[PDB]
């Protein structure tokens, strides 16, 4: 059936690590390519892009029995921000960001990016407000840029955000990160076919 807002678990081996259980909640099918799905795994801080049903990492795939769990959050999206966060590795930072949406599915959970990791994070952020931690300051088509190693990286554009128009998700062939590109700003190593 249909597993978009979806407790799910599933196996997890990428080459010759140990096989790890992965558990998560979907929070979107991706409609310009059906295969690829959104899902915020537990205790990962990065929104993921698998096809779920096609790669070979995933395995014992599942949906659980498990259930899924205003006028600040419609201020904030859209908002740049500066963020006091911990991330998975203990690493302490202050960034500039910026709050992107409400996230689906998960009612409590934005979307946001920072100009120093520019990909789609998803966090609690009216409970880091609180807590004093954060600060209120083409779709389809494929995309590629030349990489440092002197090859290309190739993706296809898969979401326009609605608050900021000319910021896109992207993803890219080689990795499970969903990137995020404001087209306003100079990231104009880009080319859109």
Same mark, same amino acid.
């Given at each position: ?6 407790? =799910?678990? +599933? ?7 140990? /096989? ?6 979907? $929070? ?24 779920? +049903? ?9 949906? /659980? ?6 006028? $600040? ?38 979307? =946001? ?12 952020? $009216? ?9 209120? /300051?083409?779709?389809?088509?494929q995309?590629?840029?030349a ?18 128009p ?11 990160? =969903?990137?995020?590109?404001?087209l ?10």
């Amino acid at each position: 059936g249909n597993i978009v807002g979806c407790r =799910i678990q +599933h196996g997890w081996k990428d080459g010759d690590e140990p /096989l790890t259980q992965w558990k998560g909640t979907v $929070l979107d099918q991706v409609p310009v390519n059906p295969s690829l799905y959104l899902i915020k795994y537990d205790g990962f801080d990065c929104v993921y892009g698998l096809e779920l +049903h096609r790669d070979e990492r995933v395995s014992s795939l599942e949906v /659980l029995p498990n259930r899924v769990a205003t006028h $600040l959050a419609e201020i904030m999206v859209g908002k740049a921000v500066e963020h006091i966060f911990e991330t998975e590795e203990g690493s302490k930072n202050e960034w500039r960001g910026m709050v992107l949406a409400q996230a689906p599915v998960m009612n409590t959970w934005f979307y =946001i990016t920072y100009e120093k990791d520019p990909v789609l994070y998803m966090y609690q952020l $009216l409970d880091d407000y609180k807590d004093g931690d954060l600060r209120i /300051l083409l779709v389809g088509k494929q995309v590629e840029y030349a990489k440092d190693d002197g090859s290309k990286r190739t993706g296809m554009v898969i979401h326009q955000v609605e608050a900021k128009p000319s910021v896109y998700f992207i993803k890219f062939d080689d990795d499970f990160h =969903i990137y995020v590109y404001d087209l306003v700003k100079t990231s104009a190593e880009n080319l859109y076919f």
